[PDB]
Amino acid sequence: EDMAKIYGAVAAVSKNVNSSVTYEVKRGTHELIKVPTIPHNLVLIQSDNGK
């Protein structure tokens, strides 16, 4: 029974090793909006007689 206690304690230490890590790479990334219409700024001004 004492040996079973000792062996189990050593096994727990051996299981404390770390396998790897995982993370998400997202810094520097932004979302894009979509502009539907082209912003023209032209207006036509004409005289009443059409001259």
Binding site: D2, K5, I6, A9, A12, V13, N16
Partner: protein, 50 residues
């Protein structure tokens, strides 16, 4: 090194938790000697193992 100290501290706590779980590995006679100064049985054993 910090890595060695951190590794030793965590492993020491894991062993102490396992030895005192269920029926303790060490007897009550040892715990009386280790607790004679007022410390807990778990604390006294952890220092002596160290």
């Amino acid at each position: 090194t910090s890595g060695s100290i951190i590794n030793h501290a965590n492993n020491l706590n894991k062993v102490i938790n396992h030895v005192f779980a269920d029926k303790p590995l060490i007897s009550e006679t040892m715990l009386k000697i280790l607790t004679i100064d007022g410390t807990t049985g778990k604390d006294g054993y952890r220092n002596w193992l160290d």
